[PDB]
Amino acid sequence: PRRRVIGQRKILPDPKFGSELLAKFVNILMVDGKKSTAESIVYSALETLAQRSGKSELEAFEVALENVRPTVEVKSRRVGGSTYQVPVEVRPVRRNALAMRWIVEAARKRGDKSMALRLANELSDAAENKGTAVKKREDVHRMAEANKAFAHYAWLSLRSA
Amino acid sequence: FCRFTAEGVQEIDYKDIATLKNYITESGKIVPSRITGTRAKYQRQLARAIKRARYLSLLPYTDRH
Amino acid sequence: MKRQKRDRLERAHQRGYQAGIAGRSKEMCPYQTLNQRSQWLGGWREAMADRVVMA
Amino acid sequence: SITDFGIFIGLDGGIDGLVHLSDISWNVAGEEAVREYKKGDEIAAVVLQVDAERERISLGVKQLAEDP
Amino acid sequence: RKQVSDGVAHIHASFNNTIVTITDRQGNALGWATAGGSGFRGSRKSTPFAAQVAAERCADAVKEYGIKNLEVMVKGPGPGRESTIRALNAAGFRITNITDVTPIPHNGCRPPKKRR
Amino acid sequence: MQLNITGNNVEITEALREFVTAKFAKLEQYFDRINQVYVVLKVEKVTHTSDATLHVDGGELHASAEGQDMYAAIDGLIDKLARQLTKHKDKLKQH
Amino acid sequence: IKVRENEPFDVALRRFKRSCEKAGVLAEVRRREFYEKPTTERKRAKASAVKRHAKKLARENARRT
RNA sequence: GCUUGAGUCUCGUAGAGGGGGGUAGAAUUCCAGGUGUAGCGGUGAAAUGCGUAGAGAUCUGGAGGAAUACCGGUGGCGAAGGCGGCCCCCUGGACGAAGACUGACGCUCAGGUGCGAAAGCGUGGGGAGCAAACAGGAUUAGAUACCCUGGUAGUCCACGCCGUAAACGAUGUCGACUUGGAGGUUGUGCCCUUGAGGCGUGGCUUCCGGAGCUAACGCGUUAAGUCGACCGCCUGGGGAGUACGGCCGCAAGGUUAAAACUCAAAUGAAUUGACGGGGGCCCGCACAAGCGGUGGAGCAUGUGGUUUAAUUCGAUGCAACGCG
């Protein structure tokens, strides 16, 4: 908004594992205001991600996540008649949430029988650098890196951190 | 500022390039009278002296010759 | 409903930067207090260079 | 002095500017969000780890402690 | 290929494009690269980044002439003109001197009337 | 672009609907892609007035014209609408 | 323009003198003969000069800060 | 008769004042040659266009035309129009110091005569760049336009014509008088030039303001203040600076200049709002970041239409349409 760096509230961590990133991930596919069955989908998917990956579950999810987190993201701008996209760097809070949104959408596609099987296979190919969300990641990097020639005025991401 | 031609009793000759090179810049351009602070009469005599010395090639027009 | 963003200090910066880029070579639309006028002019002179680098 | 979602910005010692990154802060990497883990306005352990002579970036850290 | 030592790097830096012609001391060309031919097209030609990629894609393909040091001439009041010489400090060259060959007429011919 | 006609105290005859529709179609073709148009005809004991609301991509735009015989009011409203459309059209060209 | 010197050099001096006199005269001469409005633009420029000088001078009274 | 008005002479002073001649440098274009190769150019985006027949770039040489960066100064000169590289020749005016001289020789001026930007016209040259007309590409609903790519008259010179301009300070000329300030430019006098110093004195000029004036805006010793001499011009708006006739012009057209008719207004300045594809600042689920919808389907309910014997009446942009 115009005003208000807003008084921000935190979230509850995940019960089964010591993670708030995982609780955010439950809140992403928590469709229709119903947390419990989304928790059953996430747990049911990390179990078969462990059996279909061998390694542990939290590192399985995080290694599967860092192959779809982005670095540069386009912002569409128009000046005059043109309307070109300008690469802004993603801030590392937006980064992993923007990854998990693509994982969850690419799991709502892809359709297998169950949602835990779809999301389990989608995280598996996210470890394999093979699935859909890595194609969307590489689309974002190809068009921001393709439109890389714009670093300008003041409407985006002041001096540094 | 001070006008050095007013500090002398001069009437600017075009041949003392030791003095005229204090009034060309290093690109050959004549320096304004708000910078050097000369009087306007000696500024006109100065400009005619610079252009005349350029004609006799005692001063350059530009630096790209 | 919460409180003002970057309390005119580096908002005074980007007002002087936008006003610097979009012409306005007045440097005569600033604030009047010192801590905001200083970087309205700071953004103005940081915007003159960003006008030289582009059209 | 001000934690900007990727760090904490300790700025003691006579104008030395921007410092500790979110990557160290503990022995966990990404999930930490420094506002949850340290403070606002508090004097801490932080050691230097890099001074870059050009571009005026010292980069302190906080993981250099005793947990592992 | 000629095994030249030093070169003169002309940079034509107009509004809509920058072209970079690396020549020798003599004044005859060795290799050139433009801000249009580096993949950037139309309005995107008119950026400093396309001038930087142009100076890269000239500074190699003049490798076979073996230039250690070069002068830099720059003609044109364009959006390149400084990123393209940062891209020649960074390209592995020794810059002897930098000049300005922007043609300033002691007003002669009449310019066009262009805008409304 | 579908034109909806309604009338408060004005009995919309079939010859009245043919003319209004033709005029609206002609205006729509001339200035911009228009999605829907509502026409309201009011009679208040003297003033034959007309309202129109055009829903166009940019948004709503409205005009109103009082006349003497209903037909005159409709003509005024249509010219006003055309003028408004020119403003909206290159208001969202603005290259 | 012309910069040659020892190992810390090559950028600041050059973009200074280059940028000022270059961008001035080329951005001026690039089009528009005008024949008429250097007269108007110098008249407005210098009327704005005396109005800015007298305006700041009589604006040097107070501002209630 | 007299010297104060006017004019002449002796010294200088500054100045894009005018006419003629000559010459210099940068740049643009073209031509010839070299190196080199895949683009150039252009725009808000594009295409028309140019380029593998070697373009664009870079270097060397040559040709030709035009304008004179910096100095450049709300600076200078000229009656006005206007006049900017540098040098020569011929020539006009202004200014000041000290004297001498003539002795009212003065001011204005209808008719007349002269000068008079740009465009244009005639004759002969010249033609770089730009550029009406014109072609093409776009844009647009259309686009005989703005934008782009080209491009002929013209822009230039010599000799004639035209005689108009927002030819404007929208302020006729000449003269006198009437508080100040800050500057510019150009002379000159005195004194410690002893230091870019101080005190006066003339001319031209820029701004701000005093009384006074003005409908106000504003003008304000360079008046739009107080007066005097002479001239030009005005008498509601449209018709109309048009028609007819005269005079001038090669023509375009210029000048002089009506009337019928028609309306009760037209106008100037200032005010309060409203408005702007004017500006500045702040804010809003206004945009951006997201979540879920409507529009497709069936059904419910309301409305328009159509029907009917009646389909009771009202609510209709937002702010009527599961509304009374």
PDB file of N, CA and C (backbone and C1' of nucleotides) in Angstrom, chain H residues 175-205:
ATOM      1  P     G H 175      13.793  66.032 -28.708  1.00  0.00           P
ATOM      2  O5'   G H 175      13.111  67.106 -27.759  1.00  0.00           O
ATOM      3  C5'   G H 175      13.343  68.487 -27.968  1.00  0.00           C
ATOM      4  C4'   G H 175      12.454  69.353 -27.116  1.00  0.00           C
ATOM      5  C3'   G H 175      12.454  69.079 -25.631  1.00  0.00           C
ATOM      6  O3'   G H 175      13.617  69.540 -24.976  1.00  0.00           O
ATOM      7  C1'   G H 175      10.251  69.462 -26.352  1.00  0.00           C
ATOM      8  P     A H 176      14.116  68.802 -23.645  1.00  0.00           P
ATOM      9  O5'   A H 176      13.252  69.482 -22.498  1.00  0.00           O
ATOM     10  C5'   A H 176      13.240  70.890 -22.357  1.00  0.00           C
ATOM     11  C4'   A H 176      12.102  71.344 -21.488  1.00  0.00           C
ATOM     12  C3'   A H 176      12.029  70.699 -20.122  1.00  0.00           C
ATOM     13  O3'   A H 176      12.945  71.268 -19.210  1.00  0.00           O
ATOM     14  C1'   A H 176       9.882  70.736 -21.096  1.00  0.00           C
ATOM     15  P     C H 177      13.749  70.338 -18.183  1.00  0.00           P
ATOM     16  O5'   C H 177      12.696  70.084 -17.030  1.00  0.00           O
ATOM     17  C5'   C H 177      12.181  71.183 -16.303  1.00  0.00           C
ATOM     18  C4'   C H 177      10.911  70.824 -15.584  1.00  0.00           C
ATOM     19  C3'   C H 177      11.035  69.734 -14.538  1.00  0.00           C
ATOM     20  O3'   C H 177      11.508  70.224 -13.299  1.00  0.00           O
ATOM     21  C1'   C H 177       9.131  69.352 -15.891  1.00  0.00           C
ATOM     22  P     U H 178      12.327  69.265 -12.309  1.00  0.00           P
ATOM     23  O5'   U H 178      11.244  68.235 -11.767  1.00  0.00           O
ATOM     24  C5'   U H 178      10.214  68.656 -10.888  1.00  0.00           C
ATOM     25  C4'   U H 178       9.259  67.531 -10.602  1.00  0.00           C
ATOM     26  C3'   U H 178       9.895  66.273 -10.063  1.00  0.00           C
ATOM     27  O3'   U H 178      10.137  66.361  -8.676  1.00  0.00           O
ATOM     28  C1'   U H 178       8.362  65.716 -11.773  1.00  0.00           C
ATOM     29  P     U H 179      11.490  65.761  -8.071  1.00  0.00           P
ATOM     30  O5'   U H 179      11.294  64.195  -8.258  1.00  0.00           O
ATOM     31  C5'   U H 179      12.238  63.277  -7.742  1.00  0.00           C
ATOM     32  C4'   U H 179      11.890  62.887  -6.335  1.00  0.00           C
ATOM     33  C3'   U H 179      12.904  62.020  -5.623  1.00  0.00           C
ATOM     34  O3'   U H 179      14.062  62.702  -5.193  1.00  0.00           O
ATOM     35  C1'   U H 179      10.766  61.119  -5.284  1.00  0.00           C
ATOM     36  P     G H 180      15.473  62.060  -5.591  1.00  0.00           P
ATOM     37  O5'   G H 180      15.145  60.506  -5.538  1.00  0.00           O
ATOM     38  C5'   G H 180      16.150  59.524  -5.676  1.00  0.00           C
ATOM     39  C4'   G H 180      15.761  58.266  -4.950  1.00  0.00           C
ATOM     40  C3'   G H 180      16.626  57.055  -5.220  1.00  0.00           C
ATOM     41  O3'   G H 180      17.840  57.064  -4.501  1.00  0.00           O
ATOM     42  C1'   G H 180      14.383  56.433  -5.416  1.00  0.00           C
ATOM     43  P     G H 181      19.176  56.589  -5.239  1.00  0.00           P
ATOM     44  O5'   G H 181      19.032  55.009  -5.283  1.00  0.00           O
ATOM     45  C5'   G H 181      18.872  54.281  -4.081  1.00  0.00           C
ATOM     46  C4'   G H 181      18.495  52.851  -4.340  1.00  0.00           C
ATOM     47  C3'   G H 181      19.421  52.079  -5.249  1.00  0.00           C
ATOM     48  O3'   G H 181      20.618  51.687  -4.612  1.00  0.00           O
ATOM     49  C1'   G H 181      17.197  51.626  -5.847  1.00  0.00           C
ATOM     50  P     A H 182      21.987  51.661  -5.440  1.00  0.00           P
ATOM     51  O5'   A H 182      21.941  50.247  -6.164  1.00  0.00           O
ATOM     52  C5'   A H 182      21.683  49.073  -5.414  1.00  0.00           C
ATOM     53  C4'   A H 182      21.296  47.928  -6.306  1.00  0.00           C
ATOM     54  C3'   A H 182      22.244  47.659  -7.453  1.00  0.00           C
ATOM     55  O3'   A H 182      23.362  46.894  -7.049  1.00  0.00           O
ATOM     56  C1'   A H 182      20.025  47.660  -8.251  1.00  0.00           C
ATOM     57  P     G H 183      24.834  47.342  -7.488  1.00  0.00           P
ATOM     58  O5'   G H 183      25.094  46.512  -8.817  1.00  0.00           O
ATOM     59  C5'   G H 183      25.048  47.150 -10.080  1.00  0.00           C
ATOM     60  C4'   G H 183      24.422  46.265 -11.124  1.00  0.00           C
ATOM     61  C3'   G H 183      25.030  46.365 -12.508  1.00  0.00           C
ATOM     62  O3'   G H 183      26.217  45.606 -12.647  1.00  0.00           O
ATOM     63  C1'   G H 183      22.696  46.540 -12.687  1.00  0.00           C
ATOM     64  P     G H 184      27.489  46.239 -13.390  1.00  0.00           P
ATOM     65  O5'   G H 184      27.118  46.121 -14.924  1.00  0.00           O
ATOM     66  C5'   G H 184      26.757  44.868 -15.473  1.00  0.00           C
ATOM     67  C4'   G H 184      26.221  45.028 -16.863  1.00  0.00           C
ATOM     68  C3'   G H 184      27.112  45.794 -17.818  1.00  0.00           C
ATOM     69  O3'   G H 184      28.155  45.000 -18.345  1.00  0.00           O
ATOM     70  C1'   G H 184      24.894  46.562 -18.017  1.00  0.00           C
ATOM     71  P     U H 185      29.636  45.597 -18.463  1.00  0.00           P
ATOM     72  O5'   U H 185      29.557  46.546 -19.732  1.00  0.00           O
ATOM     73  C5'   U H 185      29.109  46.049 -20.983  1.00  0.00           C
ATOM     74  C4'   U H 185      28.721  47.175 -21.900  1.00  0.00           C
ATOM     75  C3'   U H 185      29.765  48.258 -22.071  1.00  0.00           C
ATOM     76  O3'   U H 185      30.760  47.910 -23.009  1.00  0.00           O
ATOM     77  C1'   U H 185      27.668  49.250 -21.667  1.00  0.00           C
ATOM     78  P     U H 186      32.248  48.462 -22.832  1.00  0.00           P
ATOM     79  O5'   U H 186      32.131  49.997 -23.221  1.00  0.00           O
ATOM     80  C5'   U H 186      31.859  50.383 -24.555  1.00  0.00           C
ATOM     81  C4'   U H 186      31.497  51.844 -24.644  1.00  0.00           C
ATOM     82  C3'   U H 186      32.527  52.816 -24.119  1.00  0.00           C
ATOM     83  O3'   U H 186      33.614  53.019 -24.991  1.00  0.00           O
ATOM     84  C1'   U H 186      30.404  53.440 -23.334  1.00  0.00           C
ATOM     85  P     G H 187      35.096  53.002 -24.388  1.00  0.00           P
ATOM     86  O5'   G H 187      35.533  54.526 -24.392  1.00  0.00           O
ATOM     87  C5'   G H 187      35.409  55.309 -23.221  1.00  0.00           C
ATOM     88  C4'   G H 187      34.988  56.710 -23.559  1.00  0.00           C
ATOM     89  C3'   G H 187      35.715  57.816 -22.823  1.00  0.00           C
ATOM     90  O3'   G H 187      36.960  58.136 -23.416  1.00  0.00           O
ATOM     91  C1'   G H 187      33.403  58.208 -22.727  1.00  0.00           C
ATOM     92  P     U H 188      38.235  58.443 -22.495  1.00  0.00           P
ATOM     93  O5'   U H 188      37.768  59.653 -21.575  1.00  0.00           O
ATOM     94  C5'   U H 188      37.668  60.969 -22.097  1.00  0.00           C
ATOM     95  C4'   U H 188      37.024  61.906 -21.108  1.00  0.00           C
ATOM     96  C3'   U H 188      37.802  62.152 -19.831  1.00  0.00           C
ATOM     97  O3'   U H 188      38.840  63.100 -20.003  1.00  0.00           O
ATOM     98  C1'   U H 188      35.529  61.765 -19.318  1.00  0.00           C
ATOM     99  P     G H 189      40.114  63.092 -19.024  1.00  0.00           P
ATOM    100  O5'   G H 189      39.624  63.914 -17.751  1.00  0.00           O
ATOM    101  C5'   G H 189      39.167  65.248 -17.888  1.00  0.00           C
ATOM    102  C4'   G H 189      38.612  65.787 -16.595  1.00  0.00           C
ATOM    103  C3'   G H 189      39.468  65.588 -15.358  1.00  0.00           C
ATOM    104  O3'   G H 189      40.555  66.490 -15.278  1.00  0.00           O
ATOM    105  C1'   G H 189      37.228  65.079 -14.849  1.00  0.00           C
ATOM    106  P     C H 190      41.967  65.986 -14.704  1.00  0.00           P
ATOM    107  O5'   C H 190      41.819  66.155 -13.127  1.00  0.00           O
ATOM    108  C5'   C H 190      41.358  67.376 -12.572  1.00  0.00           C
ATOM    109  C4'   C H 190      40.847  67.190 -11.166  1.00  0.00           C
ATOM    110  C3'   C H 190      41.804  66.519 -10.194  1.00  0.00           C
ATOM    111  O3'   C H 190      42.779  67.411  -9.683  1.00  0.00           O
ATOM    112  C1'   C H 190      39.650  65.567  -9.966  1.00  0.00           C
ATOM    113  P     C H 191      44.274  66.901  -9.386  1.00  0.00           P
ATOM    114  O5'   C H 191      44.118  65.966  -8.109  1.00  0.00           O
ATOM    115  C5'   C H 191      43.778  66.521  -6.847  1.00  0.00           C
ATOM    116  C4'   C H 191      43.381  65.460  -5.855  1.00  0.00           C
ATOM    117  C3'   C H 191      44.441  64.425  -5.515  1.00  0.00           C
ATOM    118  O3'   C H 191      45.378  64.900  -4.564  1.00  0.00           O
ATOM    119  C1'   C H 191      42.354  63.356  -5.874  1.00  0.00           C
ATOM    120  P     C H 192      46.900  64.391  -4.581  1.00  0.00           P
ATOM    121  O5'   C H 192      46.815  62.823  -4.296  1.00  0.00           O
ATOM    122  C5'   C H 192      47.969  62.005  -4.444  1.00  0.00           C
ATOM    123  C4'   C H 192      47.754  60.597  -3.941  1.00  0.00           C
ATOM    124  C3'   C H 192      46.494  59.883  -4.400  1.00  0.00           C
ATOM    125  O3'   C H 192      46.609  59.371  -5.713  1.00  0.00           O
ATOM    126  C1'   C H 192      46.862  59.482  -2.087  1.00  0.00           C
ATOM    127  P     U H 193      45.318  59.289  -6.662  1.00  0.00           P
ATOM    128  O5'   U H 193      45.697  58.165  -7.723  1.00  0.00           O
ATOM    129  C5'   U H 193      44.768  57.757  -8.715  1.00  0.00           C
ATOM    130  C4'   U H 193      45.216  56.495  -9.405  1.00  0.00           C
ATOM    131  C3'   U H 193      45.633  55.365  -8.483  1.00  0.00           C
ATOM    132  O3'   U H 193      44.542  54.619  -7.974  1.00  0.00           O
ATOM    133  C1'   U H 193      47.282  55.651 -10.152  1.00  0.00           C
ATOM    134  P     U H 194      44.579  54.039  -6.474  1.00  0.00           P
ATOM    135  O5'   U H 194      46.123  53.806  -6.165  1.00  0.00           O
ATOM    136  C5'   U H 194      46.800  54.576  -5.185  1.00  0.00           C
ATOM    137  C4'   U H 194      48.232  54.806  -5.582  1.00  0.00           C
ATOM    138  C3'   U H 194      49.139  53.599  -5.441  1.00  0.00           C
ATOM    139  O3'   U H 194      49.082  52.755  -6.577  1.00  0.00           O
ATOM    140  C1'   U H 194      50.178  55.536  -4.505  1.00  0.00           C
ATOM    141  P     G H 195      49.295  51.170  -6.423  1.00  0.00           P
ATOM    142  O5'   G H 195      47.916  50.548  -6.918  1.00  0.00           O
ATOM    143  C5'   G H 195      47.786  49.153  -7.139  1.00  0.00           C
ATOM    144  C4'   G H 195      46.675  48.562  -6.311  1.00  0.00           C
ATOM    145  C3'   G H 195      45.285  49.114  -6.571  1.00  0.00           C
ATOM    146  O3'   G H 195      44.667  48.514  -7.693  1.00  0.00           O
ATOM    147  C1'   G H 195      45.684  49.048  -4.240  1.00  0.00           C
ATOM    148  P     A H 196      44.061  49.418  -8.874  1.00  0.00           P
ATOM    149  O5'   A H 196      42.487  49.356  -8.638  1.00  0.00           O
ATOM    150  C5'   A H 196      41.586  49.523  -9.723  1.00  0.00           C
ATOM    151  C4'   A H 196      40.748  48.287  -9.936  1.00  0.00           C
ATOM    152  C3'   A H 196      39.821  47.911  -8.791  1.00  0.00           C
ATOM    153  O3'   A H 196      38.614  48.654  -8.809  1.00  0.00           O
ATOM    154  C1'   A H 196      40.971  45.986  -9.559  1.00  0.00           C
ATOM    155  P     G H 197      38.325  49.785  -7.703  1.00  0.00           P
ATOM    156  O5'   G H 197      39.706  49.977  -6.935  1.00  0.00           O
ATOM    157  C5'   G H 197      39.802  49.709  -5.543  1.00  0.00           C
ATOM    158  C4'   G H 197      39.901  50.972  -4.719  1.00  0.00           C
ATOM    159  C3'   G H 197      38.767  51.974  -4.867  1.00  0.00           C
ATOM    160  O3'   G H 197      37.607  51.633  -4.129  1.00  0.00           O
ATOM    161  C1'   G H 197      40.830  53.103  -4.964  1.00  0.00           C
ATOM    162  P     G H 198      36.163  52.088  -4.662  1.00  0.00           P
ATOM    163  O5'   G H 198      36.057  53.616  -4.229  1.00  0.00           O
ATOM    164  C5'   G H 198      35.983  53.973  -2.859  1.00  0.00           C
ATOM    165  C4'   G H 198      36.168  55.454  -2.655  1.00  0.00           C
ATOM    166  C3'   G H 198      35.155  56.357  -3.334  1.00  0.00           C
ATOM    167  O3'   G H 198      33.938  56.460  -2.619  1.00  0.00           O
ATOM    168  C1'   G H 198      37.322  57.185  -3.726  1.00  0.00           C
ATOM    169  P     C H 199      32.563  56.725  -3.405  1.00  0.00           P
ATOM    170  O5'   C H 199      32.647  58.257  -3.830  1.00  0.00           O
ATOM    171  C5'   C H 199      32.602  59.285  -2.853  1.00  0.00           C
ATOM    172  C4'   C H 199      32.848  60.638  -3.468  1.00  0.00           C
ATOM    173  C3'   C H 199      31.870  61.062  -4.550  1.00  0.00           C
ATOM    174  O3'   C H 199      30.650  61.568  -4.039  1.00  0.00           O
ATOM    175  C1'   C H 199      34.075  61.465  -5.289  1.00  0.00           C
ATOM    176  P     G H 200      29.320  61.511  -4.940  1.00  0.00           P
ATOM    177  O5'   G H 200      29.485  62.734  -5.945  1.00  0.00           O
ATOM    178  C5'   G H 200      28.946  62.689  -7.258  1.00  0.00           C
ATOM    179  C4'   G H 200      29.679  63.634  -8.173  1.00  0.00           C
ATOM    180  C3'   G H 200      29.099  63.821  -9.562  1.00  0.00           C
ATOM    181  O3'   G H 200      28.016  64.730  -9.596  1.00  0.00           O
ATOM    182  C1'   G H 200      31.430  63.504  -9.718  1.00  0.00           C
ATOM    183  P     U H 201      26.790  64.489 -10.607  1.00  0.00           P
ATOM    184  O5'   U H 201      27.440  64.563 -12.061  1.00  0.00           O
ATOM    185  C5'   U H 201      27.831  65.806 -12.631  1.00  0.00           C
ATOM    186  C4'   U H 201      28.719  65.608 -13.835  1.00  0.00           C
ATOM    187  C3'   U H 201      28.047  65.043 -15.070  1.00  0.00           C
ATOM    188  O3'   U H 201      27.327  66.008 -15.810  1.00  0.00           O
ATOM    189  C1'   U H 201      30.058  63.878 -14.676  1.00  0.00           C
ATOM    190  P     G H 202      25.727  66.064 -15.695  1.00  0.00           P
ATOM    191  O5'   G H 202      25.213  65.558 -17.110  1.00  0.00           O
ATOM    192  C5'   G H 202      25.418  64.221 -17.529  1.00  0.00           C
ATOM    193  C4'   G H 202      25.920  64.174 -18.945  1.00  0.00           C
ATOM    194  C3'   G H 202      25.228  63.182 -19.855  1.00  0.00           C
ATOM    195  O3'   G H 202      24.004  63.668 -20.364  1.00  0.00           O
ATOM    196  C1'   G H 202      27.549  62.945 -20.090  1.00  0.00           C
ATOM    197  P     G H 203      22.740  62.689 -20.448  1.00  0.00           P
ATOM    198  O5'   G H 203      23.130  61.670 -21.605  1.00  0.00           O
ATOM    199  C5'   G H 203      23.299  62.116 -22.938  1.00  0.00           C
ATOM    200  C4'   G H 203      23.748  60.991 -23.831  1.00  0.00           C
ATOM    201  C3'   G H 203      22.840  59.779 -23.875  1.00  0.00           C
ATOM    202  O3'   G H 203      21.729  59.963 -24.733  1.00  0.00           O
ATOM    203  C1'   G H 203      25.093  59.088 -23.671  1.00  0.00           C
ATOM    204  P     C H 204      20.309  59.314 -24.372  1.00  0.00           P
ATOM    205  O5'   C H 204      20.517  57.761 -24.645  1.00  0.00           O
ATOM    206  C5'   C H 204      20.710  57.279 -25.964  1.00  0.00           C
ATOM    207  C4'   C H 204      21.191  55.851 -25.964  1.00  0.00           C
ATOM    208  C3'   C H 204      20.307  54.839 -25.260  1.00  0.00           C
ATOM    209  O3'   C H 204      19.172  54.437 -26.001  1.00  0.00           O
ATOM    210  C1'   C H 204      22.549  54.484 -24.636  1.00  0.00           C
ATOM    211  P     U H 205      17.807  54.108 -25.224  1.00  0.00           P
ATOM    212  O5'   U H 205      18.127  52.786 -24.394  1.00  0.00           O
ATOM    213  C5'   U H 205      18.324  51.541 -25.045  1.00  0.00           C
ATOM    214  C4'   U H 205      18.929  50.516 -24.121  1.00  0.00           C
ATOM    215  C3'   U H 205      18.026  49.994 -23.024  1.00  0.00           C
ATOM    216  O3'   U H 205      17.107  49.022 -23.479  1.00  0.00           O
ATOM    217  C1'   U H 205      20.153  50.487 -22.125  1.00  0.00           C
TER     218        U H 205
END
